[PDB]
Amino acid sequence: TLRAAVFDLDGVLALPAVFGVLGRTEEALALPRGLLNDAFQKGGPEGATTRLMKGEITLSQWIPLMEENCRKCSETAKVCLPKNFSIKEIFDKAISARKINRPMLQAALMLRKKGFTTAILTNTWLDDRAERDGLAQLMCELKMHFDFLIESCQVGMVKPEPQIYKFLLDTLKASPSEVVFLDDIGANLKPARDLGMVTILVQDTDTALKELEKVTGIQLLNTPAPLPTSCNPSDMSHGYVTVKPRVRLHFVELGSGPAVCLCHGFPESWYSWRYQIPALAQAGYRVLAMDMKGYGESSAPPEIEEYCMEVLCKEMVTFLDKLGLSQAVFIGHDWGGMLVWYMALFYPERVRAVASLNTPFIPANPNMSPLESIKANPVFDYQLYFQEPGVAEAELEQNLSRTFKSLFRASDESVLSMHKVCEAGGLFVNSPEEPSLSRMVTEEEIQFYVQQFKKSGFRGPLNWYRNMERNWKWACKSLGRKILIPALMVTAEKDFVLVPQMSQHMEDWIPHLKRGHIEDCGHWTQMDKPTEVNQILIKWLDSDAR
Amino acid sequence: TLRAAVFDLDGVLALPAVFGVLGRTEEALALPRGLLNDAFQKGGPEGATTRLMKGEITLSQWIPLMEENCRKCSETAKVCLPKNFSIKEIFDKAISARKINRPMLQAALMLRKKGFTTAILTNTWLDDRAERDGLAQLMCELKMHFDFLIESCQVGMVKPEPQIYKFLLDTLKASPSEVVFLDDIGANLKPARDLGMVTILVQDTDTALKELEKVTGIQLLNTPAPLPTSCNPSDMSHGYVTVKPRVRLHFVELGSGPAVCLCHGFPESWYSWRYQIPALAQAGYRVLAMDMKGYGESSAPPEIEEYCMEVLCKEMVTFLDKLGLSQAVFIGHDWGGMLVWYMALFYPERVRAVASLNTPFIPANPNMSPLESIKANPVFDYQLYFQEPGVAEAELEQNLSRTFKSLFRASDESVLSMHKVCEAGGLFVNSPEEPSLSRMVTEEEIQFYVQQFKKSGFRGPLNWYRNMERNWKWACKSLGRKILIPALMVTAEKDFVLVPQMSQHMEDWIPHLKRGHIEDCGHWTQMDKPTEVNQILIKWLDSDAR
Numbered sequence A, B: 001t002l003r004a005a006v007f008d009l010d011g012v013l014a015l016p017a018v019f020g021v022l023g024r025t026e027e028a029l030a031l032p033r034g035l036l037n038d039a040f041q042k043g044g045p046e047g048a049t050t051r052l053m054k055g056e057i058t059l060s061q062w063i064p065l066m067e068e069n070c071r072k073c074s075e076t077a078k079v080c081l082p083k084n085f086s087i088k089e090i091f092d093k094a095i096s097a098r099k100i101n102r103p104m105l106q107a108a109l110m111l112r113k114k115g116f117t118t119a120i121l122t123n124t125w126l127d128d129r130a131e132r133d134g135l136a137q138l139m140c141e142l143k144m145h146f147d148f149l150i151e152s153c154q155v156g157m158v159k160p161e162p163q164i165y166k167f168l169l170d171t172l173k174a175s176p177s178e179v180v181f182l183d184d185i186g187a188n189l190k191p192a193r194d195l196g197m198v199t200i201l202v203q204d205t206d207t208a209l210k211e212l213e214k215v216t217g218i219q220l221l222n223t224p225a226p227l228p229t230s231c232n233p234s235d236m237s238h239g240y241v242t243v244k245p246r247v248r249l250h251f252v253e254l255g256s257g258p259a260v261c262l263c264h265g266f267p268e269s270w271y272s273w274r275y276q277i278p279a280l281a282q283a284g285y286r287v288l289a290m291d292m293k294g295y296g297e298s299s300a301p302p303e304i305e306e307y308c309m310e311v312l313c314k315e316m317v318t319f320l321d322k323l324g325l326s327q328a329v330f331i332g333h334d335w336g337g338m339l340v341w342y343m344a345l346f347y348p349e350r351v352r353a354v355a356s357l358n359t360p361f362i363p364a365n366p367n368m369s370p371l372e373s374i375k376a377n378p379v380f381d382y383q384l385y386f387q388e389p390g391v392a393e394a395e396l397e398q399n400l401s402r403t404f405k406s407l408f409r410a411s412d413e414s415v416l417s418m419h420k421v422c423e424a425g426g427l428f429v430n431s432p433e434e435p436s437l438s439r440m441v442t443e444e445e446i447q448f449y450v451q452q453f454k455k456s457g458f459r460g461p462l463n464w465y466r467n468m469e470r471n472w473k474w475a476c477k478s479l480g481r482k483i484l485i486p487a488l489m490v491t492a493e494k495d496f497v498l499v500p501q502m503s504q505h506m507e508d509w510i511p512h513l514k515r516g517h518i519e520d521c522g523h524w525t526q527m528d529k530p531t532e533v534n535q536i537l538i539k540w541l542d543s544d545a546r
């Protein structure tokens, strides 16, 4: 009975096999067959390559040794090496060409999700090349998805030596019969076979995966498209900045590159961006996912005025000041999307680019009070219910698990009408006490939101709605302005509150506005359609925001 | 009696005055005198420039209006504008050319250090240009040094309108007679004068500063070179990463750009880098100043083995993994300098560049036990005193303020002989109970170290020394390697423990090694010689580490 899966790196988790370049180089250079693959394994156990693979020497110390082996092999072969020959040039190109074998990673991910312990066992080197980062980046990406990464150059042992297999079994805490071992080199497979492990010789990925599903009894081939990588809260870097004596802002941070500041809506969390964080960091950005003022680990002062847009925007600028950031790209959803348009209008020098999910940019109407504006739309009637301090807090704080389960649902799973909350006298009046679990969330994900809202409740979050007159007067100062910095509006077909048609006039105030649209997508855009949100954001970031 | 100083931005805190470019452009283009300076102020109060300065319109909306004013002014002047004329091109260049007026900032810094409230009052705009970052960067740098920044485009008021001066006085909470106001425009000075404020018309900086010292009674001109900007712990972004179930690492983070990971020595803190953090961020780097394992807000497990170099280095790699960083440049001092060389030797793919202050790279001697090695040097005898668990902890924890005051001293202030700690039987035996305060530190800075060490004490920090045999065996694995990644060795003349001559053989293992040397510098390099450390590090970072 299997409970562990071990994968090789070269030719298994990463393709084309870096090793395959010696044969391709021989053919491209019309050199005798096997000359380069031979100079590579010269001396076997006490040869240069073994010492490299055991960590005795670095890759840059190995290059001159490989060239000496190429000369010696060529002499015996009675052939001359070409004039402009470079082992460095050949290896630099092979390494940079090698990419993650996506379906092999998907299978390893599926096995782990099913309770398998997974590991990478690889014969690798200590890379000190000026171009070492490309490889570091590949390793960092791959490794996060596995329980263990065992590298020959770190353990001082090499495949096929038996000691490395005994080491592998010890780190897995598994008997050989509980382990599938996948390798593209038959000689490196054999000691795992001799010990009694299930082994798979990997040539083409499809056959290898066919052998893997037959052996595990788990479907790995022709499987549905998996969800993007999520965040385990305890594995994230958590950041804290005091913006003023009583106010601190918490954020989760991942990656390197241009700063991307993610701003959630109501009643949410930094965790609402869980599917975006790993993807945006992988795309070459420094992600800062906020707990907005009033939420999670950020400060939640009780006063209404602490939540007017002007104060919220000023603190976000202070946040950038204290972290030492001259700019960030601001991406918001819902109330976060509203803050994001106002960041662009009032602080354009600090906003690299601006993007909103669902929330359109609507200017202030100088000839109509915000109350008179809510008069027009039946959609926004629940916002009047949010006005009286204490009322909505009580209903939303009454049962947290009920609150989040009732709210966080896909377009076809709705248990809340947000209509005549005025007639009804509550958000959950003719709503179930034990709502079913939406297909968008796990019970675990609901309990995270439940745990976050236990600290401060709903006062701070609901106060974002209690600044109508203040926000209107402040917004009226920007009536002569235009948003001329790079901007993205992402509409959601099935958001029945923030409908796509509400964004129809945006081009009048944002002429160069770029757009995205998600079909069959409800209000909770990030978790409803994560794959498409990621595709839209990454494409726009790489084109419009450095 | 003065207690507040107010400075203008253009022509006062930043030079050359962006305004001065209209006259320079006129002369360079042989256009009628004042034509451009005239089109700039066309319409006065309801003209385009006032609306821009009040925040009614953005800089990009203003450019076309300025061009229209240039045409109208040219028509009246009976002159034709040149063929390739561009207001954008002219203003882009003027803004990028304008730099901080360093001696004016120094004077504002000195006044604030003396208890003055300082402010910037400026007529500025909402910059939405594709090149807005250069200006954002200048504002972010300047603003941090002042109590208030008042911008016309944010307050919707403009100099010379009287309302802005009343607003200034209200934000300062000062009566006009308590305020010096410095401006380069006479018309903008007058309302402050009418109200009774001390005013200074600024033409050349020297005369302006002469007027300022006469008026404040504080020397601001010909003053000594000030210390680099330090860190106020409560104004920093604090980060936390769990590297394993029982271990979390704390760090302070500032800036954007390539990641620079700062690693302190014994018995120190992230705060030991206080003079480096603002300078390195200002230089275009993302600074991550660690609390090393066993220190400050980082975890301090009790076990000795938790502090062997192998485990310490593995956790630093995990730290990079969890933050999503493929690399960082590693800069270490003392024990941090030792970790930094080993990071380069074992994880070169993760180390962008490596730099050490004081600590040389010394390879393991395979023919000598670490005890036998301490036998040779009388210098390292105190390390034998550190071996027995509980002994040094008691003496160092006995009186914290005494511990740090006795240790943290310049080369000429030494109260500790670290000799015959074996003969003496303690680190502080013939040492004063109330050591004087070293010129390197304030009482406040000592109390920060005192407060940090109250959490975990000296067990974790002293455990870094209790892994001699383990570190030696691990280091012996790297005996065939060379450090071939960019490296910097910074020696300190007066460090009597980590002497410069101890670094003499480094080139044998690091051939491309770069060097720096600080004269009249003791062991506490960062606070002993901050200005020079910063100059050496920034120069090396800009040349060798992206």
Ligand SMILES: CSc1ccc(O[C@]2(C)CCN(CC3CC3)C2)cc1
Pocket (backbone or CB within 6 Å): A265, A266, A267, A334, A335, A338, A359, A362, A497, A498, A523
């Ligand atoms: C007058 S412009 C405006 C419109 C809506 C608004 O509030 C929201 C952004 C809309 C939906 N609501 C969140 C509910 C959980 C769905 C917050 C705030 C301002």
Ligand SMILES: CSc1ccc(O[C@]2(C)CCN(CC3CC3)C2)cc1
Pocket (backbone or CB within 6 Å): B265, B266, B267, B334, B335, B338, B359, B362, B497, B498, B523
């Ligand atoms: C065998 S190579 C070696 C040498 C020294 C060493 O320890 C230090 C880095 C030297 C000074 N000591 C800090 C004292 C407060 C001054 C730590 C560790 C290893």
